[PDB]
Design a binder for this molecule. Sequence first.
Ligand SMILES: CCC1=C(C)/C(=C/C2=NC(=C\c3[nH]c(/C=C4\NC(=O)[C@H](C)[C@H]4CC)c(C)c3CCC(=O)O)/C(CCC(=O)O)=C2C)NC1=O
Ligand SMILES: CCC1=C(C)/C(=C/C2=NC(=C\c3[nH]c(/C=C4\NC(=O)[C@H](C)[C@H]4CC)c(C)c3CCC(=O)O)/C(CCC(=O)O)=C2C)NC1=O
Ligand SMILES: CCC1=C(C)/C(=C/C2=NC(=C\c3[nH]c(/C=C4\NC(=O)[C@H](C)[C@H]4CC)c(C)c3CCC(=O)O)/C(CCC(=O)O)=C2C)NC1=O
Ligand SMILES: CCC1=C(C)/C(=C/C2=NC(=C\c3[nH]c(/C=C4\NC(=O)[C@H](C)[C@H]4CC)c(C)c3CCC(=O)O)/C(CCC(=O)O)=C2C)NC1=O
Ligand SMILES: CCC1=C(C)/C(=C/C2=NC(=C\c3[nH]c(/C=C4\NC(=O)[C@H](C)[C@H]4CC)c(C)c3CCC(=O)O)/C(CCC(=O)O)=C2C)NC1=O
Ligand SMILES: CCC1=C(C)/C(=C/C2=NC(=C\c3[nH]c(/C=C4\NC(=O)[C@H](C)[C@H]4CC)c(C)c3CCC(=O)O)/C(CCC(=O)O)=C2C)NC1=O
Ligand SMILES: CCC1=C(C)/C(=C/C2=NC(=C\c3[nH]c(/C=C4\NC(=O)[C@H](C)[C@H]4CC)c(C)c3CCC(=O)O)/C(CCC(=O)O)=C2C)NC1=O
Ligand SMILES: CCC1=C(C)/C(=C/C2=NC(=C\c3[nH]c(/C=C4\NC(=O)[C@H](C)[C@H]4CC)c(C)c3CCC(=O)O)/C(CCC(=O)O)=C2C)NC1=O
Ligand SMILES: CCC1=C(C)/C(=C/C2=NC(=C\c3[nH]c(/C=C4\NC(=O)[C@H](C)[C@H]4CC)c(C)c3CCC(=O)O)/C(CCC(=O)O)=C2C)NC1=O
Lengths: 162, 58, 160, 160, 160, 160, 160, 158, 158, 162, 162
Amino acid sequence: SVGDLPGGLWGVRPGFQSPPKQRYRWTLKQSKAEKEALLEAIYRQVLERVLPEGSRLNEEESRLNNGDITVREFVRRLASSDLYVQSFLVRYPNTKLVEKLYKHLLGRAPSNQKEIIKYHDLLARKGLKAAVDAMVTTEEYTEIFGDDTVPFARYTTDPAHG
Amino acid sequence: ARTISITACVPRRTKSVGASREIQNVYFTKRISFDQFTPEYQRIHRQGGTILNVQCMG
Amino acid sequence: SAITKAILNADAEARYLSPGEIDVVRGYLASGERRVRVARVLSDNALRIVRGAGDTMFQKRPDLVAPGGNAYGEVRTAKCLRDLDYFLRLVTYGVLAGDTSPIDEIGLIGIKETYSLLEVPVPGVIDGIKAAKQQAAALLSSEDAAEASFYFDYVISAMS
Amino acid sequence: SAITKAILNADAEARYLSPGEIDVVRGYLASGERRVRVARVLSDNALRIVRGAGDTMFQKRPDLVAPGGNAYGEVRTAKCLRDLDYFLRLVTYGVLAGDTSPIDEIGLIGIKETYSLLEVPVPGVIDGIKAAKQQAAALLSSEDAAEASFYFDYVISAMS
Amino acid sequence: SVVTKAIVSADAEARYLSPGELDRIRGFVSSGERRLRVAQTLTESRERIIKQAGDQLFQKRPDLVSPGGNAYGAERTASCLRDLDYYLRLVTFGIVAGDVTPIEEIGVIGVKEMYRNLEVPLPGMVEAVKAMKSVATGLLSGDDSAEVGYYFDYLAGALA
Amino acid sequence: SVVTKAIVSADAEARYLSPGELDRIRGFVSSGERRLRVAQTLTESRERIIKQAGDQLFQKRPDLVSPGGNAYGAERTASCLRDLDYYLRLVTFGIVAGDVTPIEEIGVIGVKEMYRNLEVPLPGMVEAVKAMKSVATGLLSGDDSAEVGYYFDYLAGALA
Amino acid sequence: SVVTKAIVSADAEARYLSPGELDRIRGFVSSGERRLRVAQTLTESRERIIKQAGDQLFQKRPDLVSPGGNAYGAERTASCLRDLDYYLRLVTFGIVAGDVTPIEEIGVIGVKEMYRNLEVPLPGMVEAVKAMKSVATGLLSGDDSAEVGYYFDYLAGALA
Amino acid sequence: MLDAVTKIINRTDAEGRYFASKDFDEVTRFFATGEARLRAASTISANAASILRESAAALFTEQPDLLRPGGNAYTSRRYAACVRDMEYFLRYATYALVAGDTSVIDERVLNGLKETYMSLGVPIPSTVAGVTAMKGVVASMIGSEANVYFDHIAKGLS
Amino acid sequence: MLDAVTKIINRTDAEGRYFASKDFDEVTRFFATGEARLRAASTISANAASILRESAAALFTEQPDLLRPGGNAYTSRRYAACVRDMEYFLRYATYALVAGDTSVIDERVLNGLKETYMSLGVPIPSTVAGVTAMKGVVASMIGSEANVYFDHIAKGLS
Amino acid sequence: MQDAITSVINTYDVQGKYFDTSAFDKLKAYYATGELRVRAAGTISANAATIIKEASAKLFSNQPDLVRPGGNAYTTRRYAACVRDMDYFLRYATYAMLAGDTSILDERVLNGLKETYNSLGVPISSTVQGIQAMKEVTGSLVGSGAAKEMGVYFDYLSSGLS
Amino acid sequence: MQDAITSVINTYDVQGKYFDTSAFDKLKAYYATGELRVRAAGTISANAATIIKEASAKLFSNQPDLVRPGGNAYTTRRYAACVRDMDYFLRYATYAMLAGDTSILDERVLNGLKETYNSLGVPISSTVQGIQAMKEVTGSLVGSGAAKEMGVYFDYLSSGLS
Ligand SMILES: CCC1=C(C)/C(=C/C2=NC(=C\c3[nH]c(/C=C4\NC(=O)[C@H](C)[C@H]4CC)c(C)c3CCC(=O)O)/C(CCC(=O)O)=C2C)NC1=O
Ligand SMILES: CCC1=C(C)/C(=C/C2=NC(=C\c3[nH]c(/C=C4\NC(=O)[C@H](C)[C@H]4CC)c(C)c3CCC(=O)O)/C(CCC(=O)O)=C2C)NC1=O
Ligand SMILES: CCC1=C(C)/C(=C/C2=NC(=C\c3[nH]c(/C=C4\NC(=O)[C@H](C)[C@H]4CC)c(C)c3CCC(=O)O)/C(CCC(=O)O)=C2C)NC1=O
Ligand SMILES: CCC1=C(C)/C(=C/C2=NC(=C\c3[nH]c(/C=C4\NC(=O)[C@H](C)[C@H]4CC)c(C)c3CCC(=O)O)/C(CCC(=O)O)=C2C)NC1=O
Ligand SMILES: CCC1=C(C)/C(=C/C2=NC(=C\c3[nH]c(/C=C4\NC(=O)[C@H](C)[C@H]4CC)c(C)c3CCC(=O)O)/C(CCC(=O)O)=C2C)NC1=O
Ligand SMILES: CCC1=C(C)/C(=C/C2=NC(=C\c3[nH]c(/C=C4\NC(=O)[C@H](C)[C@H]4CC)c(C)c3CCC(=O)O)/C(CCC(=O)O)=C2C)NC1=O
Ligand SMILES: CCC1=C(C)/C(=C/C2=NC(=C\c3[nH]c(/C=C4\NC(=O)[C@H](C)[C@H]4CC)c(C)c3CCC(=O)O)/C(CCC(=O)O)=C2C)NC1=O
Ligand SMILES: CCC1=C(C)/C(=C/C2=NC(=C\c3[nH]c(/C=C4\NC(=O)[C@H](C)[C@H]4CC)c(C)c3CCC(=O)O)/C(CCC(=O)O)=C2C)NC1=O
Ligand SMILES: CCC1=C(C)/C(=C/C2=NC(=C\c3[nH]c(/C=C4\NC(=O)[C@H](C)[C@H]4CC)c(C)c3CCC(=O)O)/C(CCC(=O)O)=C2C)NC1=O
């Protein structure tokens, strides 16, 4: 009844990632520790863990801290960055990249063959960057995560939003 | 390439009010690359928003 | 150019030029005289290259200039030859730049939508560019012809 | 501060302060007198704490002030002792606020890359900070020493 | 729980608990005997609290137990008093836990949808929770009355 | 390597390698013989490069092998020389690959955490790598000396 | 179909169908017999429609069946007429469905890649669809011709 | 955001000095008033729904033309948004009362609000009147403890 | 971004003409200076940490007030950001040196930098002095090959 | 996750009962141990880096082939991954000692870890030995009673991976 | 992925060895063929669409039921997907030939491919026939040595599928 993780028999979440109910939102005036924690959560959620030091983006982090770009823009740039390529693309086929991108950018799994076909076609014809651009400009992303929240794994049924 | 500064107000007139802060998602200024400018333009329009100002730095 | 692409890779990782990128920039600077030579040959003979390419294309595809064809009439055929001259100038830009970036930035991005709206048969453009490649390879040495043929083939493949 | 953390947690959920959060704020407001006592003792004794900690740090690691050492010379020894004084002031701030937010905001975020680019030996800094912790514990009671040592150990662990 | 919220806050930032979170846990565990005596006191007088609070609620809201009311009949009134007992037990749980987390996860999340499906008026629930608050704080001393009242106040706000 | 970097960049963009990338690979495979001779030359000069670099490091940083230093003793000095040994082997790998990918993947990513966990001072890394640079590039001709210096400079910048 | 679009729109909003959506469905089901009779009329006249549409297409674009054309030869002309028959059957499917969804799913998605692989000129496809529309609407009444022309115009716009 | 202790710490840090007697005096004075401010904040939280209800009633009794057709508060959704904004002001005034410092109001509430209302068409003076009425209700319930934070919100909008 | 060759290509393309002998002359001159510019860039890259450390030392020795409490370079965080911006300037000057053009500096560094520094409170003449000190160090190490790009950064800040 | 208090609450809530004398005894026991747990957690957080240094030194001295070529911890990247894994093990054991409950080790650490280690080629017995080394060092630093407390969660991790 | 050079590098790194005569000979063998591989990659890239037109025409002529109603390639969408998959096979064969290694065929293509095709019902024998036709068309462009080299990677794909 109390303190159970969503998923029942599968209510587990690897400690490398964020706790399943945590939400990380960017505000314009927040402490520098809050900013660093938000960046760390973005990496933890897109790349599934913290990278060895020296691997984080330099200029993109400065833009995000300043508010020049948004969390959604940072996520877009990270998911198409060389880090994401070396982490997932070089070791998986594009079909696996479709589930990886769903998990990282939308917090869920593809539900049917049309959802796989869309981003697999984008990966096949235009590459990773086009698939990421398409996924983070969906209305589902805009309504669930908006522009300033880190994407998260979603565990409550919400048929209108996927 | 090039980057465009957009200043816009995107209202919430189509959905129920919430107790969270959304003043950022409503009125904003951001720098977007040229390739994202048409999607941003159209999504601002589709949500009932008004594009207050457009600038090209340089 | 190649220098621009190496700098972009260095910038994306917030680092200085790597030994591989330095080798790239050095090998590009070493190709300077050869690329400039090929560019002068293609630029100085541009008019005759375009004349021959248009002749060959119109021979292979008469329906282009046949009544009801896309290039029918003086103005539309001249517009066609202008497009061929455009693509040749872009090929020279690619030869000097050492990459295909100027060719994309000026003529290849949006060319398919353009030619589909105008009902320009892209295969015929491909014959015209193939003819220009043959004309230019006539005027170049084997290595020089190989150097220019890379960008001619890139234009052809981007069309098709 | 502790109140800042409770309020930020309540605002993150768009709700009012919960009984646990109200209890946290009440506990901090109760501990305020002891906090002010510990901070006052550390503040009036800053000179002797920093002097003793610097003496024992330089005795443990004489190569730091030896020629070619990172703190060799009057100016660099002065900057080293100034850094130790800075960290003592940050420990007092943390003792007052009830969390490490002042310590993190003012002195810790960015110290690692700062000392990396300056090639300042972090183990030397940690030796000075531990030395300051023992100097402070000498002037404090056992419970006051434990309260101060919490924030001293936070600083050490952030350095390490 | 206080301990669970501290651990989850530390886990969300992938860090050890700070001095502040440890202070919060110390404050919680140092109060365990008092809140546990309060839980025992509420638990032993559950019949007294439920009966008096039901009497106060039905005097304050006669429409609930008159015909056409949701609690009209002895069986529906017994159901009413039964989930008053539910909320009193949840209050005792939250008192030993130091936070409203058990109350929120057992009896608050989804409560409005449940009471709409059951046709239970939410203002009637708010009045019932206020009656339980008055009776339960009547049985406690002032300092304990305030801390229990916070839990009941959270409950009433959650039902509204 | 160079070929892998080109293929991965093309793969992530769902395209065949462009003329510029094919130029990069062509220049790389044309230089394979001289790269491979240079890597051989560095391989025969194994014991001398490691020994002289270690001597220069220990002279310019005598604290490392003084008591309490990280490289103090015969075993720790042997482990010290073994790390330089590793890094020279990585520099030969990167020379044959045409890029610093082997160096980055085997001995740069995570190197900060490794040496922090081992208490090995990074400025000692930098000085030992620069000493290896001087000794190694002392053994090659003009162009090859600069080419190998770039790899050593990448590695010394990464260790900083 | 019409019902599918209504249900999908309602499901994307996670609600029951509004009065307007049910109005769309009532309008669709009322006109069912008219659509079915139109579809039967077109299905009875399959071969004569395809024969006449092919005749007008090859009359107005003789270059398609002229030597060097995409449809030159009996086999390629038969494939052309076969594609016209496919799209006629798709139009009948769309007519009974009340919307162009069957046409879109069976013969529109990926059509341009398909015909580019087949060297089939898209303007010729547009002209064939216009010819087939002329023949098919000429067989229908004034009212029915309008809605079937709408499906043919959708198909011609999609192939354009 | 800042509380009173953090404000004093920042003031001392900007001078790079340790806490002196006067700074310890503001700190101890903040600690002395802490329990009364907590009691007031708990009182506000327990009665938030009522406070909001008669604040809205007072505002729309004073200015019924906001609720009339064509008024800024005329639709169910716009009345919702009005009361939602008043709930914002109440909650953040409570946060400022617990912290003892008005910064949380500045960064969380007032930052970009005046421009956002002008873009939305929300009337500033009527919103200020609503804040004032809410201040009156809160003061009737707890006293003058939270007056300064409501005045801060009113000045920020005005 | 633009290098010198792409800038010449854009000039010709805007004119619509094939390369003439003059344009081929600028292209050959760029190719001629390329190898020396590469050597200078490699020298800068090999000594980047030393150059950055020396230039930060020079700036803060010449303006010690920036590091005192209340200075814009006073905290570990603000100092790290200052030396981070110096590293930005050095790396982008090196990019511009290799490309033979200042376009990368304009689009990647200077665009909106003044507005960012005024919004943050970063003092512009202090940063310009830092760029000047960095220019002096880099000139001491590689000669006058890169001081035009540092001058461009200083003018863009000014 | 659950702590001792939440475990008691869960038992009594699913049974539908109020707290009895035995429940109050269990809650008193957790409150009594709370001071020891907080002390031990502070000591561990103060000393986490040193504990990792000593534990990895002992593991790589007992099994020198791990960090030599051919060993799973030979490269800077794989050594870093190793010590990061040990750090996460230490932090989650400290969490579970504070909670007085091993549930967080089930939710955040163990589930799927054996499979990941087998799939990556990580030696699992060597990882268990590293966890034991951390146990020895931590017991040294925390004292006898806190050592007996932390040993429970260390052994839980060891048996879960074994 | 691994190319030939990084394959040798990895072997010697795992052994903890410098390059010796055998390693230098393997690297010379790869460098010697590099001009041929680059020429073949350029030729294939120049003629890719033609290769796919010819290979798909041959495959659908040999198996007409694939494109008639009821076939797996009967619709415009499934025809487009089929020649898209042929584009995969051509592009990844060219990558592997240019690398001199079949690794990228393992990470990026073959892994999960049989499962994808079996779940979709894509006929695997027909796909192998299309791959064989593509091999023949490519050999009829690139020349004897490059054709023999591209054949290795085409048979690698065919064997992985069948
Ligand atoms: C916590 C910080 C915060 C504040 C303060 C805030 C104010 C705020 N009020 C809004 C809407 C609104 N606000 C009001 C306010 C009312 N207009 C009436 O005339 C009254 C005079 C007045 C209140 C007493 C109204 C009517 C709207 C709806 C505007 C519209 O969409 O037409 C909006 C647009 C987004 C939405 O509708 O949810 C914002 C951002 N938002 C924030 O995140
Ligand atoms: C430098 C970058 C650049 C390119 C590449 C370019 C292509 C281009 N060609 C165009 C027209 C045209 N292009 C052609 C050429 C076609 N005629 C035959 O069919 C051939 C198959 C084929 C050429 C070999 C023709 C005939 C037109 C006129 C079409 C019309 O009158 O509607 C147009 C439409 C604007 C106009 O009226 O000229 C563009 C944009 N324009 C540019 O600014
Ligand atoms: C209030 C927050 C704050 C902190 C913490 C801080 C640390 C700090 N110390 C610095 C220099 C320094 N710091 C030290 C201290 C070292 N000397 C020995 O080696 C020891 C291991 C160690 C001290 C225990 C030394 C010697 C320098 C001068 C180094 C140089 O200029 O090359 C610098 C570079 C700027 C300057 O020269 O002032 C910073 C930013 N600065 C701040 O604004
Ligand atoms: C542990 C969390 C929890 C709660 C709180 C809960 C309440 C709850 N109350 C119920 C019935 C009821 N509950 C009430 C109570 C209402 N009557 C008056 O109006 C009052 C205003 C108000 C109570 C103070 C009544 C009258 C019923 C019977 C109505 C019916 O049968 O539909 C039911 C339907 C099944 C049953 O009778 O057991 C539930 C589930 N269930 C839970 O699992
Ligand atoms: C139901 C959806 C669907 C369609 C539409 C479809 C079309 C289709 N057309 C094809 C060839 C063809 N299609 C055409 C038709 C075009 N050529 C002329 O220019 C005309 C303008 C035009 C027809 C009006 C021709 C001539 C060919 C033979 C091309 C060749 O093989 O060389 C083929 C290759 C297999 C074969 O020839 O049997 C297909 C699959 N397939 C489908 O699954
Ligand atoms: C490559 C493109 C790029 C540039 C140029 C850039 C500059 C830049 N510097 C910043 C902060 C800063 N920059 C400085 C530097 C100044 N302080 C003074 O004392 C010095 C004289 C002077 C440096 C020489 C400081 C102190 C800050 C922190 C300001 C603060 O924390 O309030 C910020 C705000 C975001 C952040 O905190 O990281 C930006 C965007 N960012 C970029 O992505
Ligand atoms: C290829 C990637 C890689 C590297 C580089 C690597 C180095 C490495 N060096 C180690 C120890 C060491 N490394 C050093 C070297 C340092 N001492 C001085 O300060 C010098 C500045 C400096 C050498 C120039 C020393 C002295 C030790 C012994 C430390 C001890 O006894 O614990 C260890 C611990 C276990 C062992 O002895 O092997 C590793 C793993 N391992 C790797 O998988
Ligand atoms: C908080 C719960 C949690 C754990 C524990 C966890 C473990 C974990 N360890 C990993 C890799 C690794 N783990 C190790 C550690 C082992 N190798 C040595 O030989 C030792 C004997 C031993 C450790 C003492 C190594 C070397 C790798 C790298 C494997 C590789 O790169 O192929 C990975 C693969 C992803 C990556 O490299 O970042 C995971 C998920 N993940 C979690 O979410
Ligand atoms: C590079 C590694 C890779 C491959 C190969 C790959 C293939 C692949 N082919 C797919 C569909 C398909 N693939 C084919 C191709 C087949 N049709 C048959 O007639 C032919 C014998 C055969 C091709 C020659 C077809 C028809 C579909 C559509 C299946 C359907 O919609 O039911 C799909 C489902 C998603 C989509 O429709 O885009 C995948 C993932 N994905 C990958 O990441």
